[PDB]
Amino acid sequence: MPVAHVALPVPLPRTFDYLLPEGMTVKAGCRVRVPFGKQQERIGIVVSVSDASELPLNELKAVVEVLDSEPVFTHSVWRLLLWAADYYHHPIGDVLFHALPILL
Amino acid sequence: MPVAHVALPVPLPRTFDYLLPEGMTVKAGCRVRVPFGKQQERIGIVVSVSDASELPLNELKAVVEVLDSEPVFTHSVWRLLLWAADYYHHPIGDVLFHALPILLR
């Protein structure tokens, strides 16, 4: 058949890059609505903000809107969760979202 | 200001789709050489083979070479591993490649 879905041992935090439009600011631990797939949106959680993407600064899509001015996560809670993710081999996205509810 | 590394609640097994050139055939549980990054190669294990990707069937990179005629994993072992990865929430690629050196050795 066509598409071979393959598995690879990507680096620890597997994240998806998106560009921040002019004047839009967000820090680590903030929820943001971003594009996903040819047309729908979805809530995500910003893990970090760098000045380098594994692909060009132009074919990355842009965040649509920040939903939190301040981290929905405690400085401690955040450090902890990222650790657990890494220590027990769980994807950051999975820990973070499954962790959001219990928190609120 | 520019970029941001975002965590997403992606579906159970987060896999990387690769196109199969004409005449190239591979089954679940087989290792394959695939591109990665603007120029490096790497070894991975096919989890499944379908007729569709979240991306255009032309924007995907192509598998380079299949390293296994047959599943390097037993039909039981395989079923178990995928389950283990799912139920305990471990990256399928992470469970598959670590176990290989155990099961074989």
UniProtKB/Swiss-Prot annotation, chain A:
Function noted in UniProt: Initiates the restart of stalled replication forks, which reloads the DnaB replicative helicase on sites other than the origin of replication. Recognizes abandoned replication forks and remodels them to uncover a loading site for DnaB. Serves as the scaffold for primosome assembly. There are several restart pathways, the PriA-PriB pathway is the major replication restart pathway. The PriA-PriB pathway is subdivided into 2 distinct pathways. The PriA-PriC pathway is a minor restart pathway. Recognizes and binds the arrested nascent DNA chain at stalled replication forks.
Domain of life per record: Bacteria
Protein name as annotated: Replication restart protein PriA
Quaternary context: Binds ssDNA as a monomer. Binds to replication forks, subsequently PriB then DnaT bind in a 'hand-off' mechanism, which allows DnaC to load helicase DnaB onto the fork. Forms a branched DNA-PriA-PriB complex when the lagging strand is single-stranded (ss)DNA. Component of the replication restart primosome, which is composed of PriA, PriB, PriC, DnaB and DnaT; DnaG primase associates transiently with this complex. There may be 2 PriA subunits per (pre)primosome. Interacts with single-stranded binding protein (SSB). Interacts with PriB; binding is improved in the presence of ssDNA.
Disulfide bonds: none
Notes concerning its domains: Contains an N-terminal DNA-binding domain and a C-terminal helicase domain with a number of subdomains, all of which contact ss- or dsDNA. In a PriA-PriB-replication fork structure, movement of the PriA Cys-rich region (CRR) creates a pore through which the ss-lagging DNA passes, and exposes a surface to which PriB binds. The N-terminus (residues 1-181) recognizes the 3'-end of the leading strand in stalled replication forks.
Family classification: Belongs to the helicase family. PriA subfamily.
Positions of the UniProt region annotated as 3'BD: 1-99
Phenotype upon gene inactivation: Cells are filamentous and grow slowly with low viability, chromosomes can be fragmented, partitions nucleoids poorly, increased sensitivity to UV light and mitomycin C, does not allow phage phiX1874 replication. Loss of inducible stable DNA replication (iSDR, seen in SOS-induced cells), and constitutive stable DNA replication (cSDR, seen in rnhA mutants); neither type of DNA replication requires protein synthesis, DnaA or oriC. ColE1-type plasmids are not replicated. Defective in homologous recombination, hypersensitive to mitomycin C and gamma rays.
Entry's induction text: Induced by hydroxyurea.
